[PDB]
Amino acid sequence: NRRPKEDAFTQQRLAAINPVLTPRTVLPLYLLIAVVFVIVGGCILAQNSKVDEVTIYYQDCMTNATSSWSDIPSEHWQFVFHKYKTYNTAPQWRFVDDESDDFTKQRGTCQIRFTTPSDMKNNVYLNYVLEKFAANHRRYVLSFSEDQIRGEDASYETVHDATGINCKPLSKNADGKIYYPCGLIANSMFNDTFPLQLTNVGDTSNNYSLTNKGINWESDKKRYKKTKYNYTQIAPPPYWEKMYPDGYNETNIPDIQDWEEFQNWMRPGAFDKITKLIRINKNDTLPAGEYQLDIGLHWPVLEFNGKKGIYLTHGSHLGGRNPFLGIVYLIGGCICAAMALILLTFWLFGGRKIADASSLSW
């Protein structure tokens, strides 16, 4: 028989619910989304108002600082403490010296002394902020070698003309030596020397120790591996030529499986502001007191009017003190309560009966 198969699928008789949006269904749907997003938006802004932070910019420390403790002008520092909303004791810097044998564009330690009238609770993160540095251009973010990130002995014709991500401007110097971290990303790192202890001046000389371990994800040690080059076929990239002034010896090959400041830098940030984690202390509490960190300046920004900074915070569950994410639940709960009163004032002063108003009969 050529009769087709009647199986409630070819007959299009699947089980369905057929929703009709009458104003006894979607008017409770609007006051339900309203009483969720207003209450969640109150529970985010109660959390995201208790987050404290410290931001100090120090790009104008070589030029606009003296050799004595002078207060930072207010265009650089900003810090927010919730227990002390009116707090205006400004931090003070001290530029140590032009230490007289360097590259004379940024040099010398920039000592910065601030005051914290709170308790940065358990995980005290120390980032660094970088404004107006473009790490999201086209040729920049595509210049590294993934086989050298993974630690292989790639040839010249494996880092240069690979498809997609190759280190095209930076692959050899003059002498056949492949640059071992190749590309514009690894060549152009951040190399200020941050301290490993906030110097507890004034109070007791019991320091606050900051470690640089655990600074990145501990699952990054599967694509980052130590290399197997022969210390005679590699040379440092041309902006690393003040850290390895003779070249690579038998010992100074950088273990990029363990050197985790480099692992933060090799993910290029997406926008024109860059905050990368560089110091941490998961052990102790940062109590109230006047601290001092001393940054050794090495990385120049004033030839393109960029910024360098310090970002000392305990975080949150949603990140840091970004007040957007709790405002927009209040807006999404007030619009869903506005558009439920627009459609209930119009419905009473207005409205329909719910059958036989067709244009078919009209």
Binding site: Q12, L21, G164, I215, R223, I274, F324, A355, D356
Partner: protein
Amino acid sequence: LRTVYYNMPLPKDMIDEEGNPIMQYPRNKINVYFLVLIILGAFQIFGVTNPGLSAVPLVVIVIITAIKDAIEDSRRTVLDLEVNNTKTHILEGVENEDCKFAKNYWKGVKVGDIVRIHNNDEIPADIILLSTSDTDGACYVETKNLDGETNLKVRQSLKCTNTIRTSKDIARTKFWIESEGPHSNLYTYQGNMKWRNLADGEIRNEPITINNVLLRGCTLRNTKWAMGVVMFTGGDTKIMLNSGITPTKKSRISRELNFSVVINFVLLFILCFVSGIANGVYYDKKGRSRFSYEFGTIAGSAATNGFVSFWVAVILYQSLVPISLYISVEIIKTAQAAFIYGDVLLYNAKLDYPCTPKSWNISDDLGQVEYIFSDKTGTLTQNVMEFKKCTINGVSYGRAYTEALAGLRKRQGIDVETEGRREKAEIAKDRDTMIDELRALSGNSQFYPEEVTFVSKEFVRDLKGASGEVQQRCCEHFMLALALCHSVLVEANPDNPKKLDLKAQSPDEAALVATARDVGFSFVGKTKKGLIIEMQGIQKEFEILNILEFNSSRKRMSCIVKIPGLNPGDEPRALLICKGADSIIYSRLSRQSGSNSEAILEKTALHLEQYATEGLRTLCIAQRELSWSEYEKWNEKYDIAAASLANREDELEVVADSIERELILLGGTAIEDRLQDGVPDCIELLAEAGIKLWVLTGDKVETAINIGFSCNLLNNEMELLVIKTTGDDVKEFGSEPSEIVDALLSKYLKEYFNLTGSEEEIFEAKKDHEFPKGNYAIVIDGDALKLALYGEDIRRKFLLLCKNCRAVLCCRVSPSQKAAVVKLVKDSLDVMTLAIGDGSNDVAMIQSADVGIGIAGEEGRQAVMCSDYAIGQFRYLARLVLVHGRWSYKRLAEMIPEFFYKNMIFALALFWYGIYNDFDGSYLYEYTYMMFYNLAFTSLPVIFLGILDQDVNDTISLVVPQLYRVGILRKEWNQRKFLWYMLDGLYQSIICFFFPYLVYHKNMIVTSNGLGLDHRYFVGVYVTTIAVISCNTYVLLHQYRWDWFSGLFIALSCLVVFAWTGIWSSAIASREFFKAAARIYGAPSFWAVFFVAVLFCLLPRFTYDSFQKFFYPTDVEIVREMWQHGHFDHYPPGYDPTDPNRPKV
């Protein structure tokens, strides 16, 4: 010249005149793949992009024309996949001397390549057979690939050459065969097939007749194997040159689809131009980070005014979206047309036959139809005939009470009163016939009023005659000529050798001879020279020698007969008998006889117009004795016409026209013609839905009006226009008041229809798709249709009067005038037409429409091949149009604006990230969220909205037919609706980008643990996920029918973005996108910008729908309001009002 070769190697590398491929011979291939490879080759898989802006129209103008027409014509590629790749084991690559079959290639078959046939094989070429595998060459074919005729026709080879069947005689032929070339015919082929014997080398003949005709479309059924060479393979034949003229019928949504695709590219080209100029403005600033930490030159114009080779790859990636569109709509149109095939309520169980689509891509043209052009008989009529009434010598005798109820409206109390003594009348007398082959079971067609009153009106009163009861001699001459003039043949059923059945092509001639063998005159045999009829049992053979044929543009058929020698010493004169329509027989009569225009001929026309208002289909019988001296003055005139090449066109008609010039009236005949079941329920159900139905019939005006009442086309509306004279336009210049016949067509349409409606000549406000309020109906004589379609400015008066009326009854309409009036309404208006009908005389009406429906099972399966859908009876049209067309219009009118929506919610955030990397060209998305977005992430819920979305049930589509009036008015697919979905996709692309941006706009850590995830490829997981969910749950809120099968495949498309991230970004090979599952999805700021961006995408539109279906609802919301309140709960599931057996409810 057409040639065939054997005992030749037939080279492909021969330059001289010895082989095939030089002379333009057909090849079986009946580019694209290189273009789609280099599009993927340019978009950074392997290879490089094309340089510069050298393809910004050159990609677009090929992608809306060349790889639209290649994808939208994928119906015939699967039909080509019926030709090739059905492969079995064959006999192609065989040398001259290799006695064993070899597996080879089907489209490599050569002109003259012999292949043995098997079971279930399409015959790949024009084979010529000599021997069968059965006795007597009995071959009965099954021809699904050639014609709609799924039944028997004789394939008979010549008897003497059936014995030679062994395969050890292969090398016996060395010549080419004499044939006619391809001349665009379907059924007729007379060839000449000569070959040579084996044992000595002598030639013999085998003339191919209509019995042994073989074609490429043939498929020889129920034989085992045969051995014969082939003639035609490729694209040059007779079964393929009748077609190919057709432009394969692109639909209407599929032709306005290119305005949508172009204005997508224009929006893209604005964005890739504003970006390219602001990229060069960035490079001319000389104060940026680019100089030191990047090794860039101190210059502008990176490639050509900045980086534009990036934006070439953005343009070329967005060209994969139109290719993704046409693949998507050709797996929706193909699936909507496989659900029409699989419906059990479109199934004709009497003749084992589902609704078969012949065109799998015009399923949305059924949802916008406001003109259905119907034929009358065969489609609005079950086309089985029954002889009822007849007139002989002016006086009428014969009654019936069959469908007078459609004419006897108010004066009806005759339920059983007439039919009671009518049955008593025929049972009391009609046993007293005296003739052989009286079969009284089927003999009740004309129940005897009086012919002779069973006393024969004996000759003892007048041997010489002419004094009384000449009607007795006239009636015997009538029913003799009614039995003699036909085209019905004699066969014998195997049930009874004594009882004999009669089958014919025209069911009138089957019904006319049926009563003619009930009252004497038994038509029992057909001799090859004569014709055997027993007049009252007494056998006498009549020799016929000219059968003048019948096509529907002729409206009559004639026949000659030679009276044998009855007088001593004289060969008597001949007699012609002509039957046909009364509109052409009364125009050809005698003006010199004694039976001229008086009351004896006037009351014959008075009775036949009384028979047509009774409802019967009228017909006239007319004769003339031809003198034997002038008889052979026109037989040799057929030697230059019928014996020559011109035996199928108008030279044979004009030489047959010269004999039929004047005739004499013998009598008339009327025939019962019953309607199909549910036709009065199908017309009434379509005319509720706002469809303007016409009936393009071919018989008399008063019949089609009375059929038009009992099929519920007419209520009380009619307005008639008629020529009421016998003249035509022989003028060239002037004489408009002096000459009549087109002047009273001009004065009737203009001056008598400023009354109802007030219109004039041309004005461009002429396109109003509303159903007309005041019910009126044109009935037009057809001769007044030739005068109202002859010139311009009178065809616009016919078209503007028929635009404003609900029904048009075109009567006496030739099949060339059927197709002329379909394409008049089709092109001069902006409307979409359907043309349902069967019959070989109804194929130009079907092809000249938009949709063409073909009724199968009846006398004509020629209108099934030229059709698009092929329903069984007529009543399946209202189930096809109102259910499977109204659905399939609103499915394609919602997934097209939801395919350009889902592009812009994702691929426009590559522009919004452009304003933060200074338009330089870093991709926001990680390399496989661009591959798999439009392919695997969000691609399925727009496929299951095109396939399985239904607004109301299949019952409610028929109970409320007026929901079809939305597609007639074109309110679901306009170009305004398309632009609002691009503005909704542009709003939700700043929600899907700038809500993940503002979590990073102070650009701190967004993680709970401070480790930071701020790479480009990690913001494009925030952006991609809340774009995938907000254009998959946008689909779920904009479909009706939340079933389990679509809601599960929206859920599995919403969780495949979480699953491909968990698999690819845990694999070691994904560079710098490595644990983005456990870093991003485990972050609490992902799951807090997820639930508020999915809101704000869906919030302006779900509020607008709430404002739209509360205060300004559609008709399909209000029906869906009433259906929850139980107004349609007493209708059963699986419902159709067009059914005679299912109850009313």
